[PDB]
Amino acid sequence: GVEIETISPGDGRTFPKKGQTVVVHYTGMLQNGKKFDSSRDRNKPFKFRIGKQEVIKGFEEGAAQMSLGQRAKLTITPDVAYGATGHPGVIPPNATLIFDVELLNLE
């Protein structure tokens, strides 16, 4: 599953709903802190819809637990990331992933 360690608190009133577009900045890393993806490096906030499987299950689940403005570290185990396969070239098999996620807006 997903564990969340808060970095900055959110507002505690605005949580993502099912189907809702959330806008985040994120950095996706392997368990050693090696970055494999970052919206920050693109200078473009990333949008996806909660519960529509547009991102890995753990990312979606983690963001659903966050309130607007919150920044959190998500620890995501392989069964809710890329599993035993992994992502060839990108994510090794059975990889635990760490995402630094900031919830910037809900649409």
XYZ file of all heavy atoms in Angstrom:
821
model
N 0.805 -1.209 0.000
C 0.000 0.000 0.000
C 0.843 1.266 0.000
O 1.973 1.274 -0.491
N 0.287 2.345 0.541
C 0.952 3.642 0.518
C 1.046 4.209 1.919
O 0.038 4.313 2.611
C 0.124 4.680 -0.252
C 0.981 5.877 -0.619
C -0.518 4.068 -1.458
N 2.244 4.600 2.328
C 2.393 5.369 3.564
C 2.691 6.817 3.255
O 3.392 7.131 2.292
C 3.488 4.809 4.473
C 3.022 3.671 5.371
C 1.796 4.023 6.228
O 1.917 4.882 7.135
O 0.710 3.428 5.999
N 2.164 7.701 4.089
C 2.302 9.124 3.859
C 2.997 9.814 5.025
O 2.565 9.711 6.171
C 0.926 9.760 3.645
C 0.275 9.174 2.394
C 1.037 11.269 3.551
C -1.200 9.329 2.388
N 4.085 10.509 4.726
C 4.746 11.323 5.730
C 4.610 12.776 5.318
O 5.193 13.201 4.323
C 6.216 10.921 5.863
C 6.402 9.503 6.391
C 7.854 9.050 6.376
O 8.576 9.296 7.371
O 8.275 8.443 5.365
N 3.823 13.541 6.073
C 3.555 14.932 5.709
C 4.804 15.808 5.798
O 5.559 15.731 6.762
C 2.424 15.541 6.572
O 1.231 14.765 6.407
C 2.150 16.987 6.157
N 5.017 16.627 4.773
C 6.113 17.586 4.744
C 5.579 18.985 5.087
O 6.168 19.702 5.896
C 6.801 17.588 3.362
C 7.448 16.218 3.092
C 7.837 18.685 3.275
C 7.930 16.042 1.653
N 4.458 19.361 4.475
C 3.753 20.594 4.822
C 2.270 20.302 4.909
O 1.713 19.615 4.052
C 3.997 21.692 3.786
O 5.383 21.847 3.533
N 1.610 20.838 5.941
C 0.194 20.523 6.126
C -0.666 21.148 5.040
O -0.295 22.175 4.475
C -0.118 21.134 7.498
C 0.867 22.270 7.622
C 2.106 21.829 6.914
N -1.794 20.513 4.736
C -2.781 21.084 3.844
C -3.871 21.779 4.653
O -3.712 22.002 5.852
N -4.976 22.111 4.003
C -6.023 22.906 4.645
C -6.982 22.069 5.492
O -7.699 22.609 6.341
C -6.772 23.769 3.619
C -7.710 22.971 2.720
O -7.756 21.721 2.804
O -8.408 23.604 1.895
N -6.998 20.759 5.234
C -7.775 19.803 6.008
C -9.269 19.864 5.766
O -10.061 19.404 6.587
N -9.660 20.418 4.627
C -11.069 20.608 4.309
C -11.385 20.241 2.882
O -12.536 19.983 2.535
C -11.479 22.054 4.594
C -12.118 22.213 5.969
C -11.599 23.457 6.615
N -11.764 23.493 8.065
C -11.100 22.727 8.927
N -10.272 21.786 8.509
N -11.300 22.875 10.225
N -10.351 20.220 2.056
C -10.542 20.010 0.645
C -9.761 18.755 0.257
O -8.561 18.833 0.009
C -10.042 21.248 -0.165
O -10.437 22.457 0.501
C -10.596 21.237 -1.573
N -10.443 17.611 0.247
C -9.840 16.333 -0.134
C -10.361 15.908 -1.495
O -11.504 16.210 -1.853
C -10.164 15.254 0.906
C -9.519 15.484 2.241
C -10.145 16.265 3.207
C -8.291 14.912 2.539
C -9.552 16.478 4.443
C -7.689 15.115 3.773
C -8.319 15.903 4.731
N -9.529 15.209 -2.272
C -9.979 14.862 -3.622
C -11.161 13.894 -3.592
O -11.199 12.992 -2.751
C -8.743 14.190 -4.238
C -7.588 14.764 -3.473
C -8.105 14.893 -2.062
N -12.122 14.098 -4.484
C -13.252 13.181 -4.601
C -13.045 12.225 -5.771
O -12.214 12.476 -6.638
C -14.547 13.964 -4.785
C -14.855 14.896 -3.603
C -16.185 15.592 -3.762
C -16.124 16.642 -4.869
N -15.184 17.749 -4.509
N -13.804 11.133 -5.793
C -13.695 10.159 -6.884
C -14.005 10.810 -8.226
O -15.025 11.475 -8.379
C -14.636 8.975 -6.666
C -14.488 7.876 -7.730
C -15.562 6.796 -7.613
C -15.224 5.579 -8.483
N -15.281 5.866 -9.957
N -13.111 10.627 -9.192
C -13.294 11.182 -10.514
C -12.753 12.585 -10.676
O -12.668 13.091 -11.796
N -12.382 13.213 -9.564
C -11.963 14.614 -9.563
C -10.563 14.809 -10.112
O -9.667 14.030 -9.810
C -12.013 15.185 -8.148
C -11.774 16.672 -8.096
C -12.198 17.297 -6.785
O -12.178 16.654 -5.733
N -12.587 18.562 -6.841
N -10.381 15.868 -10.898
C -9.065 16.233 -11.397
C -8.261 16.884 -10.288
O -8.691 17.865 -9.691
C -9.154 17.199 -12.590
O -9.698 16.506 -13.719
C -7.768 17.723 -12.960
N -7.097 16.326 -10.001
C -6.195 16.940 -9.048
C -4.964 17.452 -9.792
O -4.561 16.906 -10.827
C -5.798 15.976 -7.910
C -7.027 15.280 -7.364
C -4.838 14.944 -8.411
N -4.400 18.534 -9.280
C -3.248 19.152 -9.891
C -2.112 19.086 -8.884
O -2.233 19.584 -7.762
C -3.546 20.616 -10.253
C -2.386 21.228 -11.053
C -4.871 20.720 -11.034
N -1.007 18.447 -9.269
C 0.095 18.256 -8.340
C 1.415 18.655 -8.972
O 1.524 18.734 -10.188
C 0.205 16.773 -7.873
C -1.082 16.318 -7.210
C 0.572 15.850 -9.056
N 2.406 18.933 -8.134
C 3.793 18.788 -8.566
C 4.322 17.550 -7.870
O 3.997 17.292 -6.699
C 4.647 19.995 -8.189
C 4.865 20.951 -9.315
N 5.241 20.539 -10.578
C 4.766 22.301 -9.371
C 5.367 21.596 -11.362
N 5.084 22.677 -10.655
N 5.115 16.761 -8.580
C 5.621 15.539 -7.987
C 7.018 15.220 -8.490
O 7.410 15.642 -9.584
C 4.693 14.353 -8.293
C 4.786 13.860 -9.730
C 5.686 12.842 -10.094
C 3.986 14.417 -10.723
C 5.779 12.398 -11.409
C 4.067 13.974 -12.041
C 4.962 12.968 -12.375
O 5.033 12.540 -13.675
N 7.741 14.461 -7.677
C 9.004 13.858 -8.071
C 8.931 12.383 -7.713
O 8.671 12.027 -6.560
C 10.173 14.529 -7.347
O 10.198 15.910 -7.711
C 11.518 13.880 -7.734
N 9.135 11.525 -8.710
C 9.066 10.092 -8.508
C 10.474 9.526 -8.435
O 11.297 9.778 -9.329
N 10.740 8.762 -7.378
C 12.079 8.259 -7.087
C 12.055 6.791 -6.714
O 11.057 6.276 -6.209
C 12.705 9.019 -5.913
C 12.948 10.491 -6.156
S 13.172 11.367 -4.588
C 11.466 11.576 -4.055
N 13.174 6.118 -6.957
C 13.381 4.787 -6.419
C 13.753 4.923 -4.942
O 14.110 6.012 -4.485
C 14.494 4.069 -7.183
C 14.270 3.951 -8.694
C 15.479 3.313 -9.367
C 12.996 3.162 -9.004
N 13.682 3.814 -4.214
C 13.859 3.783 -2.757
C 15.195 4.399 -2.292
O 15.342 4.763 -1.123
C 13.651 2.334 -2.264
C 13.936 2.045 -0.790
C 12.954 2.724 0.149
O 11.769 2.869 -0.169
N 13.443 3.145 1.320
N 16.128 4.565 -3.223
C 17.417 5.180 -2.923
C 17.459 6.688 -3.187
O 18.498 7.323 -3.011
C 18.532 4.487 -3.707
C 18.386 4.663 -5.205
O 17.346 5.107 -5.689
N 19.431 4.317 -5.947
N 16.334 7.255 -3.611
C 16.256 8.680 -3.885
C 16.623 9.070 -5.302
O 16.673 10.254 -5.629
N 16.893 8.077 -6.145
C 17.196 8.315 -7.551
C 15.921 8.697 -8.283
O 14.980 7.909 -8.343
C 17.770 7.047 -8.192
C 19.149 7.213 -8.810
C 19.673 5.887 -9.381
C 18.836 5.379 -10.555
N 19.332 4.065 -11.088
N 15.907 9.892 -8.859
C 14.730 10.417 -9.545
C 14.497 9.683 -10.874
O 15.441 9.471 -11.637
C 14.948 11.910 -9.793
C 13.820 12.620 -10.511
C 14.274 14.003 -10.985
C 14.867 14.805 -9.844
N 15.401 16.123 -10.304
N 13.264 9.275 -11.166
C 12.965 8.733 -12.496
C 11.933 9.569 -13.282
O 11.730 9.359 -14.475
C 12.554 7.249 -12.429
C 11.281 7.001 -11.675
C 10.048 7.111 -12.313
C 11.310 6.666 -10.327
C 8.873 6.892 -11.622
C 10.132 6.440 -9.633
C 8.919 6.560 -10.276
N 11.296 10.521 -12.604
C 10.273 11.361 -13.214
C 10.039 12.571 -12.307
O 10.107 12.451 -11.082
C 8.978 10.548 -13.365
C 7.932 11.233 -14.232
O 8.259 12.190 -14.960
O 6.770 10.781 -14.199
N 9.786 13.731 -12.906
C 9.501 14.951 -12.138
C 8.719 15.966 -12.966
O 9.147 16.338 -14.061
C 10.802 15.606 -11.656
O 10.550 16.896 -11.124
N 7.577 16.414 -12.446
C 6.825 17.484 -13.085
C 7.549 18.795 -12.799
O 7.415 19.761 -13.545
C 5.392 17.554 -12.529
O 5.411 17.820 -11.126
N 8.316 18.835 -11.712
C 9.038 20.061 -11.374
C 10.102 20.367 -12.404
O 10.254 21.515 -12.824
C 9.654 19.987 -9.977
C 8.610 19.999 -8.869
C 9.247 20.184 -7.503
N 8.279 19.964 -6.431
C 7.399 20.870 -6.009
N 7.345 22.079 -6.563
N 6.565 20.558 -5.031
N 10.822 19.330 -12.828
C 11.819 19.474 -13.892
C 11.214 19.926 -15.218
O 11.900 20.522 -16.040
C 12.615 18.179 -14.081
C 13.543 17.876 -12.905
O 13.864 18.800 -12.134
O 13.953 16.706 -12.749
N 9.929 19.652 -15.430
C 9.247 20.118 -16.635
C 8.627 21.506 -16.450
O 8.098 22.076 -17.396
C 8.140 19.138 -17.040
C 8.630 17.729 -17.346
C 7.500 16.879 -17.926
N 6.434 16.578 -16.966
C 6.366 15.464 -16.235
N 7.316 14.548 -16.329
N 5.358 15.264 -15.395
N 8.680 22.025 -15.225
C 7.985 23.267 -14.862
C 6.517 23.296 -15.298
O 6.006 24.318 -15.768
C 8.739 24.491 -15.394
C 10.049 24.723 -14.663
O 11.126 24.430 -15.182
N 9.958 25.234 -13.438
N 5.843 22.163 -15.137
C 4.447 22.034 -15.517
C 3.738 21.162 -14.500
O 4.002 19.958 -14.435
C 4.331 21.370 -16.899
C 4.692 22.285 -18.065
C 5.019 21.514 -19.344
C 3.790 20.884 -19.982
N 4.125 20.305 -21.330
N 2.827 21.757 -13.711
C 2.011 20.944 -12.803
C 1.333 19.796 -13.564
O 0.974 19.935 -14.734
C 0.962 21.944 -12.270
C 1.591 23.287 -12.418
C 2.497 23.194 -13.638
N 1.181 18.659 -12.900
C 0.653 17.458 -13.526
C -0.783 17.237 -13.079
O -1.091 17.368 -11.906
C 1.520 16.252 -13.144
C 1.051 14.943 -13.738
C 1.206 14.679 -15.093
C 0.486 13.969 -12.934
C 0.782 13.463 -15.642
C 0.062 12.751 -13.471
C 0.203 12.505 -14.831
N -1.663 16.904 -14.017
C -3.072 16.682 -13.685
C -3.471 15.240 -13.922
O -3.060 14.633 -14.912
C -3.975 17.600 -14.519
C -3.679 19.083 -14.366
C -4.745 19.935 -15.047
C -4.397 21.417 -14.983
N -5.429 22.278 -15.654
N -4.263 14.684 -13.004
C -4.860 13.375 -13.209
C -6.142 13.251 -12.412
O -6.379 14.002 -11.459
C -3.913 12.242 -12.822
C -3.592 12.188 -11.362
C -4.283 11.328 -10.515
C -2.583 12.984 -10.833
C -3.987 11.271 -9.175
C -2.280 12.933 -9.479
C -2.987 12.079 -8.651
N -6.946 12.273 -12.792
C -8.250 12.083 -12.184
C -8.229 10.950 -11.179
O -7.907 9.805 -11.527
C -9.285 11.780 -13.262
C -9.761 12.992 -14.020
C -10.832 12.611 -15.025
N -10.333 11.630 -15.983
C -11.106 10.796 -16.678
N -12.425 10.823 -16.516
N -10.564 9.931 -17.528
N -8.580 11.272 -9.938
C -8.655 10.291 -8.864
C -9.538 9.115 -9.260
O -10.663 9.302 -9.734
C -9.220 10.917 -7.565
C -8.246 11.949 -7.008
C -9.472 9.845 -6.517
C -6.866 11.380 -6.703
N -9.017 7.900 -9.090
C -9.813 6.703 -9.310
C -9.987 6.277 -10.756
O -10.709 5.322 -11.036
N -9.317 6.964 -11.677
C -9.436 6.634 -13.098
C -8.203 5.900 -13.628
O -8.038 5.762 -14.843
C -9.701 7.891 -13.929
C -11.052 8.556 -13.609
C -12.167 7.509 -13.539
C -13.549 8.140 -13.411
N -14.320 8.021 -14.690
N -7.351 5.441 -12.715
C -6.149 4.686 -13.073
C -5.271 5.402 -14.102
O -4.774 4.788 -15.047
C -6.511 3.285 -13.586
C -7.197 2.394 -12.566
C -8.715 2.508 -12.604
O -9.321 2.619 -13.679
N -9.339 2.475 -11.429
N -5.082 6.699 -13.918
C -4.268 7.471 -14.837
C -2.817 7.524 -14.354
O -1.924 7.983 -15.069
C -4.842 8.876 -14.998
C -6.197 8.887 -15.715
C -6.679 10.291 -16.044
O -6.209 11.242 -15.390
O -7.534 10.441 -16.946
N -2.603 7.046 -13.133
C -1.274 6.977 -12.533
C -1.277 5.689 -11.734
O -2.335 5.085 -11.550
C -1.025 8.136 -11.553
C -0.943 9.466 -12.287
C -2.121 8.173 -10.497
N -0.117 5.277 -11.234
C -0.052 4.048 -10.445
C -0.979 4.115 -9.230
O -1.266 5.196 -8.701
C 1.384 3.712 -9.998
C 2.019 4.903 -9.285
C 2.233 3.288 -11.189
C 3.367 4.579 -8.605
N -1.459 2.950 -8.811
C -2.488 2.849 -7.778
C -2.079 3.567 -6.491
O -2.888 4.257 -5.866
C -2.797 1.372 -7.509
C -3.870 1.121 -6.456
C -5.161 1.858 -6.801
C -6.381 1.214 -6.149
N -6.600 1.674 -4.746
N -0.814 3.426 -6.115
C -0.315 4.048 -4.905
C -0.258 5.564 -4.927
O -0.427 6.214 -3.898
N -0.007 6.128 -6.104
C 0.050 7.577 -6.287
C -1.376 8.116 -6.091
O -1.605 9.065 -5.348
C 0.561 7.855 -7.708
C 0.966 9.292 -7.989
C 1.592 9.603 -9.191
C 0.697 10.327 -7.104
C 1.979 10.926 -9.492
C 1.072 11.649 -7.400
C 1.710 11.944 -8.588
N -2.323 7.491 -6.775
C -3.746 7.844 -6.704
C -4.269 7.734 -5.275
O -4.940 8.633 -4.753
C -4.483 6.834 -7.583
C -5.795 7.230 -8.166
C -6.208 6.243 -9.250
O -6.088 5.011 -9.031
O -6.606 6.697 -10.340
N -3.978 6.610 -4.640
C -4.408 6.378 -3.267
C -3.826 7.391 -2.298
O -4.515 7.862 -1.386
C -3.970 4.995 -2.806
C -5.023 3.926 -2.904
C -4.549 2.627 -2.281
O -4.224 2.632 -1.065
O -4.485 1.611 -3.012
N -2.551 7.699 -2.469
C -1.871 8.640 -1.607
C -2.461 10.036 -1.723
O -2.745 10.676 -0.707
N -2.661 10.495 -2.955
C -3.215 11.820 -3.193
C -4.629 11.956 -2.639
O -5.034 13.041 -2.231
C -3.183 12.164 -4.685
N -5.382 10.858 -2.619
C -6.755 10.904 -2.113
C -6.774 11.144 -0.616
O -7.783 11.591 -0.059
C -7.499 9.623 -2.452
N -5.659 10.845 0.040
C -5.554 11.062 1.482
C -5.054 12.463 1.841
O -4.969 12.818 3.020
C -4.601 10.044 2.097
C -4.788 8.634 1.615
C -5.807 7.887 2.418
O -5.910 8.071 3.631
N -6.574 7.034 1.753
N -4.692 13.242 0.830
C -4.077 14.543 1.063
C -5.109 15.650 0.934
O -6.053 15.519 0.164
C -2.934 14.765 0.055
C -1.782 13.788 0.240
S -0.482 13.931 -0.987
C 0.064 15.636 -0.816
N -4.939 16.740 1.684
C -5.790 17.910 1.471
C -5.029 18.967 0.676
O -3.806 18.958 0.622
C -6.342 18.493 2.784
O -5.311 18.731 3.718
N -5.778 19.849 0.035
C -5.230 20.937 -0.757
C -4.121 21.689 -0.022
O -4.276 22.061 1.145
C -6.366 21.875 -1.154
C -6.003 23.094 -1.988
C -5.597 22.670 -3.374
C -7.192 23.995 -2.049
N -2.979 21.853 -0.691
C -1.853 22.572 -0.128
C -0.823 21.683 0.548
O 0.307 22.098 0.779
N -1.210 20.455 0.865
C -0.344 19.537 1.592
C 0.815 19.077 0.707
O 0.647 18.868 -0.499
C -1.145 18.324 2.060
C -0.364 17.313 2.876
C -1.257 16.228 3.423
O -2.464 16.238 3.189
N -0.674 15.282 4.153
N 1.994 18.951 1.301
C 3.098 18.307 0.613
C 3.474 17.082 1.416
O 3.599 17.137 2.646
C 4.285 19.257 0.441
C 5.483 18.635 -0.287
C 6.366 19.730 -0.849
N 7.503 19.204 -1.598
C 8.516 19.955 -2.032
N 8.524 21.261 -1.780
N 9.524 19.407 -2.716
N 3.631 15.952 0.739
C 3.873 14.721 1.464
C 4.831 13.810 0.719
O 4.926 13.866 -0.508
C 2.560 13.992 1.719
N 5.541 12.980 1.479
C 6.320 11.881 0.913
C 5.459 10.622 0.916
O 4.952 10.216 1.961
C 7.590 11.655 1.724
C 8.455 10.543 1.184
C 9.788 10.455 1.926
C 9.795 9.305 2.922
N 11.183 8.765 3.183
N 5.269 10.014 -0.254
C 4.509 8.769 -0.351
C 5.468 7.597 -0.508
O 6.272 7.576 -1.441
C 3.570 8.787 -1.576
C 2.205 9.485 -1.533
C 2.285 10.810 -0.829
C 1.635 9.651 -2.940
N 5.379 6.616 0.382
C 6.128 5.367 0.200
C 5.189 4.331 -0.360
O 4.188 3.974 0.267
C 6.752 4.875 1.522
O 7.657 5.875 1.997
C 7.511 3.552 1.323
N 5.491 3.861 -1.567
C 4.554 3.026 -2.292
C 5.178 1.666 -2.555
O 6.236 1.578 -3.171
C 4.157 3.696 -3.630
C 3.490 5.053 -3.353
C 3.240 2.792 -4.446
C 3.339 5.939 -4.584
N 4.529 0.615 -2.073
C 5.053 -0.745 -2.218
C 4.733 -1.288 -3.625
O 3.812 -0.796 -4.281
C 4.489 -1.676 -1.107
O 3.094 -1.886 -1.313
C 4.700 -1.059 0.255
N 5.497 -2.291 -4.100
C 5.413 -2.703 -5.510
C 4.033 -3.144 -5.978
O 3.724 -2.983 -7.156
C 6.369 -3.906 -5.584
C 7.312 -3.730 -4.454
C 6.558 -3.015 -3.373
N 3.227 -3.712 -5.086
C 1.910 -4.218 -5.473
C 0.948 -3.097 -5.861
O -0.073 -3.345 -6.506
C 1.307 -5.076 -4.357
C 1.127 -4.308 -3.071
O 2.150 -3.918 -2.465
O -0.035 -4.093 -2.661
N 1.266 -1.868 -5.462
C 0.486 -0.710 -5.887
C 1.349 0.248 -6.703
O 1.047 1.442 -6.830
C -0.163 0.013 -4.686
C -1.320 -0.827 -4.137
C 0.874 0.300 -3.605
N 2.435 -0.286 -7.251
C 3.258 0.466 -8.181
C 3.394 -0.357 -9.456
O 2.415 -0.538 -10.174
C 4.604 0.779 -7.577
N 4.585 -0.880 -9.727
C 4.805 -1.595 -10.999
C 4.956 -3.112 -10.860
O 5.232 -3.811 -11.841
C 5.977 -0.991 -11.772
C 5.711 0.413 -12.257
C 6.120 1.517 -11.515
C 5.031 0.640 -13.450
C 5.871 2.808 -11.954
C 4.787 1.927 -13.905
C 5.207 3.006 -13.157
O 4.952 4.284 -13.606
N 4.766 -3.610 -9.641
C 4.724 -5.041 -9.389
C 5.997 -5.810 -9.687
O 7.104 -5.267 -9.663
N 5.833 -7.098 -9.970
C 6.976 -7.976 -10.180
C 7.638 -7.711 -11.520
O 8.832 -7.932 -11.672
C 6.557 -9.436 -10.068
N 6.857 -7.239 -12.488
C 7.391 -6.877 -13.797
C 8.308 -5.665 -13.694
O 9.451 -5.685 -14.166
C 6.265 -6.526 -14.796
O 5.270 -7.557 -14.801
C 6.832 -6.361 -16.194
N 7.802 -4.604 -13.073
C 8.510 -3.341 -13.059
C 8.221 -2.602 -14.354
O 7.250 -2.902 -15.049
N 9.039 -1.612 -14.674
C 8.912 -0.947 -15.962
C 10.262 -1.014 -16.641
O 11.192 -0.319 -16.240
C 8.447 0.505 -15.816
C 7.901 1.087 -17.085
N 8.668 1.251 -18.221
C 6.659 1.522 -17.408
C 7.924 1.763 -19.184
N 6.700 1.940 -18.716
N 10.378 -1.878 -17.663
C 11.655 -2.172 -18.327
C 12.427 -0.913 -18.698
O 11.921 -0.050 -19.419
C 11.235 -2.948 -19.589
C 9.739 -2.741 -19.715
C 9.252 -2.574 -18.308
N 13.646 -0.808 -18.178
C 14.477 0.355 -18.418
C 14.299 1.437 -17.369
O 15.196 2.245 -17.155
N 13.150 1.444 -16.699
C 12.818 2.546 -15.795
C 12.735 2.103 -14.338
O 13.387 2.667 -13.455
C 11.467 3.182 -16.173
C 11.185 4.387 -15.288
C 11.460 3.580 -17.640
N 11.912 1.096 -14.096
C 11.646 0.629 -12.741
C 11.989 -0.849 -12.664
O 11.388 -1.654 -13.376
C 10.148 0.776 -12.375
C 9.628 2.184 -12.693
C 9.914 0.406 -10.913
C 10.194 3.275 -11.787
N 12.927 -1.216 -11.777
C 13.287 -2.629 -11.587
C 12.105 -3.415 -11.037
O 11.161 -2.807 -10.533
C 14.416 -2.570 -10.555
C 14.229 -1.294 -9.850
C 13.651 -0.333 -10.848
N 12.134 -4.747 -11.168
C 11.097 -5.610 -10.593
C 10.986 -5.406 -9.089
O 11.988 -5.103 -8.444
C 11.628 -7.011 -10.885
C 12.378 -6.840 -12.182
C 13.042 -5.494 -12.061
N 9.776 -5.555 -8.564
C 9.512 -5.447 -7.122
C 10.110 -4.207 -6.489
O 10.750 -4.286 -5.440
C 10.037 -6.683 -6.392
C 9.391 -7.948 -6.881
O 8.167 -8.022 -7.011
N 10.209 -8.954 -7.182
N 9.912 -3.061 -7.132
C 10.499 -1.825 -6.642
C 9.526 -1.073 -5.737
O 8.379 -0.835 -6.111
C 10.922 -0.945 -7.801
N 10.000 -0.707 -4.548
C 9.287 0.252 -3.701
C 9.638 1.651 -4.180
O 10.805 1.954 -4.429
C 9.691 0.108 -2.232
O 9.216 -1.145 -1.736
C 9.089 1.245 -1.399
N 8.635 2.505 -4.334
C 8.877 3.829 -4.882
C 8.561 4.891 -3.843
O 7.747 4.661 -2.947
C 8.024 4.054 -6.127
C 8.117 2.953 -7.183
C 7.256 3.353 -8.367
C 9.564 2.721 -7.602
N 9.218 6.034 -3.978
C 8.988 7.197 -3.120
C 8.565 8.365 -4.008
O 9.275 8.722 -4.958
C 10.289 7.650 -2.397
C 10.930 6.508 -1.600
C 10.015 8.885 -1.519
C 10.009 5.870 -0.620
N 7.416 8.961 -3.710
C 6.981 10.138 -4.447
C 6.885 11.330 -3.498
O 6.268 11.220 -2.445
C 5.605 9.898 -5.072
C 5.637 9.144 -6.371
C 5.930 7.797 -6.395
C 5.326 9.779 -7.561
C 5.933 7.095 -7.579
C 5.327 9.071 -8.765
C 5.636 7.723 -8.757
N 7.505 12.442 -3.878
C 7.337 13.724 -3.204
C 6.183 14.398 -3.921
O 6.294 14.721 -5.104
C 8.605 14.570 -3.361
C 8.577 15.855 -2.524
O 7.548 16.561 -2.516
O 9.599 16.159 -1.873
N 5.069 14.598 -3.223
C 3.854 15.103 -3.874
C 3.313 16.350 -3.173
O 3.183 16.365 -1.955
C 2.743 14.027 -3.935
C 1.467 14.590 -4.599
C 3.231 12.774 -4.687
N 3.012 17.384 -3.955
C 2.356 18.582 -3.436
C 1.037 18.820 -4.155
O 0.994 18.938 -5.365
C 3.254 19.816 -3.579
C 2.727 21.017 -2.799
C 3.672 22.202 -2.843
O 4.568 22.210 -3.712
O 3.526 23.121 -2.002
N -0.042 18.897 -3.393
C -1.361 19.051 -3.968
C -1.660 20.535 -4.158
O -1.908 21.246 -3.191
C -2.385 18.397 -3.041
C -3.838 18.419 -3.500
C -3.963 18.045 -4.972
C -4.655 17.473 -2.614
N -1.615 20.995 -5.404
C -1.684 22.420 -5.721
C -3.096 22.934 -5.964
O -3.394 24.093 -5.677
C -0.849 22.727 -6.965
C 0.613 22.292 -6.880
C 1.323 22.629 -8.188
C 1.284 22.969 -5.694
N -3.950 22.085 -6.520
C -5.316 22.494 -6.842
C -6.208 21.274 -7.052
O -5.720 20.172 -7.308
C -5.331 23.415 -8.074
C -6.564 24.327 -8.125
O -7.351 24.374 -7.188
N -6.725 25.049 -9.230
N -7.513 21.476 -6.907
C -8.522 20.480 -7.249
C -9.488 21.144 -8.225
O -9.950 22.256 -7.984
C -9.300 20.031 -6.005
C -8.540 19.251 -4.939
C -9.466 18.752 -3.848
C -7.889 18.085 -5.599
N -9.795 20.474 -9.325
C -10.687 21.060 -10.323
C -12.068 20.406 -10.316
O -12.217 19.221 -10.016
C -10.064 20.984 -11.715
C -8.685 21.614 -11.793
C -8.162 21.711 -13.214
O -8.712 21.033 -14.112
O -7.197 22.473 -13.436
